[PDB]
DNA sequence: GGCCCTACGGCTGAAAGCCGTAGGGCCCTACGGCTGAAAGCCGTAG
């Protein structure tokens, strides 16, 4: 819900 | 004044009316669920509080073409129980209850149902908001069952942890096993609870719905409730991020 | 493979099958525990699941499903409805379910759904199930052999007489009223003391100790003929009335306030039946009808009358044309040894007491069997304390566990059970405080076994055990008479 | 009486509803490929015992335990949820085993909850494998009284094997099913090639996942949509039924297969409503000659002044005899919604399997060290056995025995209690050497476990070995056949 | 021949055979059983008419109520014959009318309520033996499997918990292949055919059992109950 | 969304329904993306 990570780092 | 069904009616069937005849002292509780409406029929003050229960979700009146909406028995019931009329025919002089309380679960589906309810009021009956007739009733979340003394009710985990700490520190005693009842909706409450927590005027916790700007409400309603999916998607993506920080 | 079958034989077979199944296993109470199968199986499913008073309430759906899947192969509809009637304090004089949530009201007001309500046994229901795990009642396999179910419950108070039972069967229909607990206890105490009395001696005693029905709804019984007819013959007809008080308005007017009503009189249908006889103008003396009942004052129906009207006349007309006065038609049917029977009061007392004594005798036998087992183990343990060093030696010098077992049988004069006990014994128990606790537990169990053999040998003590356990129960759980009796 | 602005209320409430539906009702977690209701029905079943070694339990008991302990919504839409998982025209790899009337590929509804029986399937046991070994985070339930798993170990790529489908707020997801063996070939790649990048992996998986594989058979027509969906998360895959022309002097059209999710009764009704309209001439009569023994069979006699190819293609056009599966690979990753390519789905599942096996090995290690630290104090009690027996007997209480035990040797309170609780049975000759041998075996195992935690190569190995065990035992032949257009 | 639906009852799964001789109406205890029947039937010949619950008792009920009960209407329509004087055996749409009620005790009761309808309202259907009863098993003792048709026949068969005894409380617990093979496959099933030998002895029995004289029903029950097991 | 139809006995008081166990049902709505031009299909929720 913030637009971080995507592949690497998972989704954030 | 207005006549209330008794034996002769001329009003909705699900409606359980009030004895009083004066709208300035009468109140209509629109209540999610027939279980919860039934247990509010019992807990009320039959003098002044009427009850229209709703099967689950209401028709979305902003996606739904005006014709299907009037054929919908629940919307037609909410309209007939208010006496006013809809759109340009509306008349606040014919209003049947000068407090309209929306009581829905404290769950996300009660938020959706109270959202389908405030969409209807705003599009068919805007004046009822403008004059401060439409309220929201805040249900409780916990019963605290002290042993020797009266129970307490708590409406937020903050209040629950405060009341548990304060009572224990006062020497009151509580079971670990069955001691604090978490409610998950109004259907889980008996009539005495519903009265002591959302219907008795002297311990009620209501919220008056107001209208600052009827034009940005018009576009808000259009976005959230209407048929434009992209506008929704964009709205949720823009605002979900900051839901935990709106009151700091 | 068509198989011709005459219609007279099929109608006869299939309809008697339905009728016996409804008569002995659905609609009629068994005389010992007061329970139709549905009540027995719901409350056993709860007990076995844990939904006791100690634990917290568990959603009804869990009791309804546990019942339907292990004991009661019928629809979740009626099982929920049965459980609910058991939780209502206006339906059972001594409710056996503790419900949380909207379980209904005296009116047409319905109960909430199965998903919103929670439910567990009441403490009296636990008396119904006291020591059911001590082989006190017969158990049989359920409909599919996967588990076992009680045939009857210990029923340590007299449920059938306390909570009543009402059931439409085929060809007959029971309708036993409830009674006050302290009274029934007096009757049972008599029937235990005078265990030898002929039927009519007993009947007169119980009839005078059991002054009459005690409905959960309070109200009034008028006259004694019906009640006597019921207990002597098992059929009677008991006039009941509600309670009215008279009020005088600030301005000379008078009113009639109804606060209690007869048993199983729906409040809504009664207010409707007055309004539909002033509307059809045959019940005059009334001018309006306002229902001031709220959950905080209880029932409160207010009937305001004309100034050219007399209070007591309108009251008598309400008695005659509404149910402010109605007759409980007693018919005292119940299942005894799998057959229906209309029973007199002394029979309902003797048959229940005979059940209690079956229960205490079975319970005392069970405890005696299990106690003999425990002393046979502690005696093989004292035989090894005395000879402890030789034992420990034998075991530290035995190849297997089986060689040490055979060696301990050869070395004392003991079973394979006593040996096996010895090997299963922890070292934490070889301290001095513990070796003493062993000899002492033997002393205690041989005292207890003595007492139990005594019990099994003197029926005087058996009856005395029933008396004293039921007096404990009545003192924790007895309540005052609700229903007032007059002449 | 506090005021509230209609704008603020409408916003706070609709956002809370929409995010709750997006994250916790409509959309599948990417690892185990389940919505909450599914995870909670499978988990209450597991916990209740309704496994395939044991007799089917009355299907009311699973609904009751699901709604009681974990999922506080209606029995109706939990019965339906459970029922769908046992229809084999709905799950390519069904997770519930149904005895009774569970519906039909048409409009025959399922028997009420009180009639049916239900337990878990072997694959669904593989969704729960070693969930009792700290292989997944648990959190407290709706009332804190018990705990539930956030996710299941999912020892097979359930999300892709079984698809998902769901309407949320502001979006919606439609992942088709796939052949378990093909999915396992692709996972095997991502394991043997763990360092490889996204271009390469997308290449390799797209090459081992030839496309959807539906429980209903049928056909996929065209390679493009399959490839769109896998490369960008969205794509329109056209499916076809199978027609079998048969020539009393009468020529017929026998439908034996249909596209996934096509209602058999609504299909017949659409033919009969477009021959009532009269915009599909050429048909003599429509007759469902279908039964449990012959399977789907909708025989369609055609007129002797009509041709077979022409009418078949008219049906492809105006009906769902061919129709288009519109994928939108959308799932919840790390708590947020994400559309994903086929390389991001396979990789995300794989990382989950590795997580699960390094967690299970952590658990196994801790428990091995527990049991060894105990066994060590027992063998120290054996080498000095005469001293210890004499000490206890001479003690007065058990705490005094215990203190003396910690004096004599150098043991903890855990170890002294484990010697105290030690039963005489174990002081036999074969049993003391059993204690010794046991300490040795457990230290061996402890070594193996340390070694696995050091070497990711070994962790990928355990995933490949255990998933091939599974896929050999439970995988099956591809159903939907693939053609081009 | 007779037309089959593609005015007949709303709930009727009909057959796709036009020759009543070779056709069969299976009449069933509600929708959940109707389901398994419709799935496992042979749709060429067998039709399925589900009824909701216990049908109205005709012998206790004035005729005008009986004809407004929707399930009765479904039955009269589904057969077509009409009733009483207007009865027209010519118009009979099925030449086996099979009563398949749940194998349990309440299914025997539904069976009696229905044979009462058919005797007071289309008695020649029984005279010409177009009325049958089907024997859906109540129990599958799995062990060489075996089937049992009442709570008693179960214990004689277990004397003579892992998917062993399986109770079929309705046809809804039954998946179509088992309902096909136990009750409906014409090549192995056992149908039971209702016959009428003394009409007057039959007529008096129905009044006794199904009618309003509860004083005459009670005495019948208590005089013939202990002696039912011995009618063979 | 509990509210509907049956059986079953006994009261009333005269034709139904009430009462408590049993058999069996009825289908509104929101939500996103379709096909097709309105609409209802599908799967989790009230
Ligand atoms: Mg809720
Ligand atoms: Mg739409």
Contact E94, E19 (CB under 8 A): no
Contact D51, D119 (CB under 8 A): yes
Residue E166, min C-alpha distance to chain C (Å) = 6
Q: Which two tokens stand for residue C138?
A: 């017969």
**Phi-psi map region of E57: left, alpha, beta (phi>0 left; psi -120 to 50 alpha):** beta
**Structural domain tally of chain B?**
1
Task: Decide: residue D211, CB within 10 A, 0-12 exposed, 13-18 middle, 19+ buried.
Answer: buried
Gap from C187 CA to F40 C1', in Å? 70
Cβ neighbours of C146 in E, within 8 Å: 161, 165
Q: Does E35 sit within 8 Å of D104, measured CB to CB?
A: yes
Closest CA to C373 of C451, C445, C424, C450: C445
The answer for residues whose C-beta is within 8 angstroms of residue D315's C-beta and 6 or more apart is D243, D271, D280, D321
CB B3: neighbour CB atoms within 10 A? 11
**Helix, strand, coil shares of chain C as percentages rounded to 5?**
50, 15, 35
In whole angstroms, give the CA distance from residue C35 to residue C85.
Answer: 13
Gap from C146 CA to F4 C1', in Å? 36
Number of H helices, E strands in chain E: 9, 7
In whole angstroms, give the CA distance from residue D406 to residue C175.
Answer: 72
Report chain E's C-alpha Rg in angstroms: 18
Task: Decide: residue C393, CB within 10 A, 0-12 exposed, 13-18 middle, 19+ buried.
Answer: exposed
In whole angstroms, give the CA distance from residue B215 to residue C474.
Answer: 71
Q: Does D113 sit within 8 Å of C433, measured CB to CB?
A: no
Give the position of tokens 């009680």. Answer: C150
The answer for residues whose C-beta is within 8 angstroms of residue C34's C-beta and 6 or more apart is C155, C158, C159, C160, C161, C162, C163, C165
Nucleotides of F under 7 A from a protein CB: 1-3, 5-13, 16, 18-26, 28-36, 39, 41-46
Residue E16, min C-alpha distance to chain D (Å) = 8
In whole angstroms, give the CA distance from residue C424 to residue E25.
Answer: 68
Q: Which two tokens stand for residue E140?
A: 């599958």
In whole angstroms, give the CA distance from residue C240 to residue C230.
Answer: 14
Closest CA to D79 of D104, D60, D55: D60
Q: Tell me how the structure was determined.
A: X-ray
Half-sphere exposure of D455 (CA within 13 A, CB side): 10
Contact C4, E190 (CB under 8 A): no
In whole angstroms, give the CA distance from residue D335 to residue C472.
Answer: 58
The answer for residues whose C-beta is within 8 angstroms of residue A3's C-beta and 6 or more apart is none
Q: Which of B109, B165, B227, B228 is catalytic?
A: B109
The response to whether E104 counts as a known ligand-binding position is yes
**3-class secondary structure for B83-146?**
CCCCHHHCCHHHCCCCEEEEECCCCHHHHHHHHHHHHHHHHHCCHHHHCCCEEEECCCCEEECC
Contact C394, C408 (CB under 8 A): yes
Give the position of tokens 């917290």. Answer: C56
Resolution in A: 3.0
Verify whether residue B165 is a known catalytic residue.
Answer: no
Give the position of tokens 């192995």. Answer: E188
In whole angstroms, give the CA distance from residue D286 to residue D301.
Answer: 7
Closest CA to C156 of C475, C474, C481, C482: C474
Q: Which of B34, B45, B62, B107 is catalytic?
A: B107
Cβ neighbours of B244 in A, within 8 Å: none
Closest CA to E24 of E90, E101, E98, E114: E98
Contact D338, A6 (CB under 8 A): yes
Residue of B35, B41, B151, B180 for testing the chain C interface, max C β-carbons within 10 Å: B35
**Phi-psi map region of E74: left, alpha, beta (phi>0 left; psi -120 to 50 alpha):** alpha
Q: Which two tokens stand for residue C179?
A: 């009674």
In whole angstroms, give the CA distance from residue D56 to residue D97.
Answer: 8
Other chains touching E, judged by 3 or more CB pairs under 8 Å: C, D
Length of chain A counted residue by residue: 12
In whole angstroms, give the CA distance from residue B168 to residue B173.
Answer: 6
Number of H helices, E strands in chain B: 9, 8
Q: Which two tokens stand for residue E7?
A: 């005015």
Q: Which two tokens stand for residue B162?
A: 């405060």
DSSP at D66: I
CB pairs < 8 Å spanning C and D: 113
Closest CA to D337 of D11, D26, D14, D15: D26
Q: Which two tokens stand for residue C66?
A: 């546990």
Verify whether residue B67 is a known catalytic residue.
Answer: no
Residue nearest to nucleotide F1 (CA to C1'): B55
In whole angstroms, give the CA distance from residue A8 to residue B1.
Answer: 69
- Residues by chain with Cβ below 5 Å of ion ligand 1: B 105, 107, 185
Number of H helices, E strands in chain A: 0, 0
Task: Decide: residue D47, CB within 10 A, 0-12 exposed, 13-18 middle, 19+ buried.
Answer: middle
The response to whether B32 counts as a known ligand-binding position is yes
Shortest CA distance from C273: residue in chain B:
B7
Q: Which two tokens stand for residue D122?
A: 């072997």
Verify whether residue B22 is a known catalytic residue.
Answer: no
In whole angstroms, give the CA distance from residue E55 to residue E117.
Answer: 9
Contact B115, D17 (CB under 8 A): yes
Closest CA to C343 of C211, C204, C231: C231
Closest CA to C464 of C130, C125, C472: C472
Contact C247, C121 (CB under 8 A): no
Scanning B43-82 for CB atoms below 8 A from D yields: none
Verify whether residue B109 is a known catalytic residue.
Answer: yes
Q: Considering only CB atoms, which residues of chain C are within 8 Å of chain D?
A: 56, 58-59, 61-62, 64-66, 68-69, 74-76, 114-115, 146, 388, 392, 395-401, 403-404, 422-428, 430-434
Owning domain of residue E97: 1-232
Residue B101 CA to ligand 2 center (angstroms) comes to 30
Q: φ and ψ at C399, to 5 degrees?
A: -60, -50
Give strand pairing partners of B99. B27
Contact E50, E31 (CB under 8 A): yes
Domain boundaries, chain C: 1-487
Cβ neighbours of E180 in D, within 8 Å: 292
Cβ neighbours of E183 in D, within 8 Å: none
Task: Decide: residue D422, CB within 10 A, 0-12 exposed, 13-18 middle, 19+ buried.
Answer: buried
Scanning B209-238 for CB atoms below 8 A from A yields: 237
Q: Which two tokens stand for residue B243?
A: 């839901």
Cα distances (Å, whole numbers) of residue D264 to C361, D136, D216, D240: 66, 40, 11, 14
Shortest CA distance from E150: residue in chain C:
C17
Q: Does A10 sit within 8 Å of D344, measured CB to CB?
A: no
Q: Which ligand is nearest to the CA of C115?
A: 1
Sign of CA pseudo-dihedral E8, E12, E15, E16: positive
Residues in chain B followed by a break, C to N above 2.5 angstroms: 6
Could you give the strand order of the β-sheet that contains C220-222, starting from the edge strand earlier in sequence?
A: C325-328, C238-241, C220-222, C484-486
Q: Does E166 sit within 8 Å of C144, measured CB to CB?
A: yes
SS3 category, B184: coil
Strands D57-58 and D117-120, how do they pair?
antiparallel
The response to whether B107 counts as a known ligand-binding position is yes
Gap from D122 CA to F1 C1', in Å? 36
In whole angstroms, give the CA distance from residue C343 to residue C320.
Answer: 31
Cα–chain-centroid distance for residue C278? Answer: 43
Residue B64 CA to ligand 2 center (angstroms) comes to 9
Residue B205, min C-alpha distance to chain A (Å) = 33
The answer for residues whose C-beta is within 8 angstroms of residue C445's C-beta and 6 or more apart is C371, C374, C375, C378
Q: Which of B27, B32, B152, B193 is catalytic?
A: B32
Residue C271, min C-alpha distance to chain E (Å) = 30
Gap from C23 CA to F41 C1', in Å? 50
Q: Which ligand is nearest to the CA of D142?
A: 1
Cβ burial D262-280 (10 Å sphere, 16+ → b, else e): bebeebbebbeebbeeeeb
Closest CA to C376 of C411, C407, C412: C412
Residue D166 CA to ligand 2 center (angstroms) comes to 14
Cα distances (Å, whole numbers) of residue E5 to D273, D283, D296, D298, E17: 15, 18, 20, 16, 10
Give strand pairing partners of B153. B143
Half-sphere exposure of C21 (CA within 13 A, CB side): 15
Q: Does C12 sit within 8 Å of E194, measured CB to CB?
A: no
Scanning C132-161 for CB atoms below 8 A from E yields: 143-146
In whole angstroms, give the CA distance from residue C259 to residue D400.
Answer: 70
Q: Which H helix or E strand runs over D138?
A: strand D138-140
What is the maximal distance between C-alpha atoms in chain E?
56
Q: φ and ψ at C217, to 5 degrees?
A: -90, 5
Contact D261, D326 (CB under 8 A): no
CB C259: neighbour CB atoms within 10 A? 16
Give the position of tokens 């259009």. Answer: B222
Contact C15, E116 (CB under 8 A): no
Q: Would you list the DSSP string of C405-465?
A: HHHHHHHSS--HHHHHHHHT-BGGGGSHHHHHHHHHHHHHHHHHHHHHHHHHH-HHHHHHH
Gap from B32 CA to F26 C1', in Å? 21
Other chains touching A, judged by 3 or more CB pairs under 8 Å: B, D
């Amino acid at each position: 819900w913030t637009x971080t990570h995507x592949x690497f780092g998972x989704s954030x | 004044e207005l006549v209330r069904r008794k034996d002769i009616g001329g009003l909705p069937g699900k409606l359980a009316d009030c004895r009083s005849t004066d709208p300035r002292k009468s109140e209509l509780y629109v209540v999610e669920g027939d279980s919860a409406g039934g247990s509010a029929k019992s807990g009320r003050d039959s003098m002044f509080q009427a009850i229209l229960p709703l099967r689950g979700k209401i028709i979305n009146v902003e996606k739904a073409r005006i014709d299907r909406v009037l054929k919908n028995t629940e919307v037609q019931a909410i309209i007939t129980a208010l006496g006013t009329g809809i759109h340009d025919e509306f008349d606040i002089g014919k209003l049947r209850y000068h407090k309209i309380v929306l009581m829905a679960d404290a769950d996300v589906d009660g938020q959706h149902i109270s959202t389908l309810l405030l969409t209807l009021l705003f599009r068919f009956m805007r004046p009822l908001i403008e004059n401060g007739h439409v309220f929201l009733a805040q249900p409780p979340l916990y019963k605290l069952k002290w042993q020797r003394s009266d129970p307490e009710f708590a409406y937020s985990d903050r209040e629950r942890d405060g009341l548990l700490e304060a009572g224990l520190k006062a020497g009151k005693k509580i079971n670990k096993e069955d001691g604090i009842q978490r409610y998950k909706g109004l259907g889980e409450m008996d009539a005495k609870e519903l009265w002591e927590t959302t219907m008795d005027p002297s311990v009620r916790v209501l919220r008056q719905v107001t209208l600052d700007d009827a034009a940005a409400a018009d576009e808000l309603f259009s976005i959230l409730m209407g048929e434009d999916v992209d506008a929704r998607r964009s709205f949720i993506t823009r605002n979900a991020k900051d839901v935990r920080f709106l009151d700091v | 493979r068509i198989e011709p079958v005459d219609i007279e034989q099929e109608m006869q077979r299939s309809y008697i099958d339905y009728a016996m199944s409804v008569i002995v296993g659905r609609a009629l109470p068994e005389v010992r525990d007061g329970l139709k199968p549905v009540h027995r199986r719901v409350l056993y499913a709860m007990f076995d699941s844990g939904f006791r008073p100690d634990r917290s309430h568990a959603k009804s759906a869990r009791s309804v499903a546990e019942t339907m899947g292990n004991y009661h192969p019928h629809g979740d509809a009626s099982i929920y409805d049965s459980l609910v009637r058991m939780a209502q304090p206006w339906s059972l004089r001594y409710p056996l379910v503790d419900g949380q949530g909207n379980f209904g009201s005296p009116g047409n007001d319905p109960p909430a759904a199965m998903r919103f309500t929670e439910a567990r046994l009441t403490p009296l229901a636990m008396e119904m199930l006291r020591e059911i795990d001590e082989e006190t009642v017969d158990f049989i396999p359920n409909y599919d052999g996967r588990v076992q179910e009680p045939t009857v419950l210990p029923s340590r108070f007299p449920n059938l007489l306390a909570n009543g039972s009402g059931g439409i069967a085929v060809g007959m229909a029971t309708n036993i009223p409830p009674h006050n607990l302290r009274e029934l206890a007096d009757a049972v105490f008599w029937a235990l003391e005078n265990h030898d009395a002929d039927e009519e001696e007993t009947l007169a005693a119980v009839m005078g100790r059991v002054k009459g029905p005690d409905f959960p709804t309070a109200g009034l019984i008028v006259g004694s003929q019906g009640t006597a007819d019921a207990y002597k013959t098992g059929r009677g007809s008991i006039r009941m009335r509600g309670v009215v008080e008279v009020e005088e308005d600030s301005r000379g007017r008078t009113s009639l306030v109804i606060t209690e009503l007869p048993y199983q009189v729906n409040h809504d249908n009664f207010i409707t039946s007055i309004a539909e006889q002033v509307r059809d103008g045959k019940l005059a003396g009334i001018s309006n009808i306002e229902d001031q009942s709220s959950d905080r004052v209880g029932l409160r129906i207010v009937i305001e009358i004309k100034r050219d009207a007399v209070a007591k006349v309108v009251i008598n007309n309400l008695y005659k044309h509404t149910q402010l006065q109605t007759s409980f038609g007693a018919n005292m049917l119940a299942i005894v040894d799998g057959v229906p029977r209309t029973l007199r009061l002394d029979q309902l007392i003797r048959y229940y007491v005979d059940h209690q004594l079956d229960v205490i005798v079975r319970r005392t036998t069970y405890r005696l069997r299990k106690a003999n087992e425990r002393a046979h183990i502690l005696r093989g343990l004292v035989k090894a304390l005395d000879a402890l060093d030789e034992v420990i030696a034998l075991i530290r010098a035995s190849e297997t566990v089986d060689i040490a077992r055979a060696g301990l049988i050869e070395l004392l004069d003991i079973d394979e059970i006593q040996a096996q006990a010895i090997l299963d014994m922890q070292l934490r128990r070889l301290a001095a405080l513990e070796r003493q606790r062993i000899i002492d537990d033997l002393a205690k169990i041989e005292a207890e076994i003595a007492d139990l053999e005594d019990i099994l040998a003197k029926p005087e003590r058996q009856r005395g055990i029933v008396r004293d356990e039921l007096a404990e129960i009545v003192d924790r759980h007895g309540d005052d008479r609700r229903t007032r009796i007059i002449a």
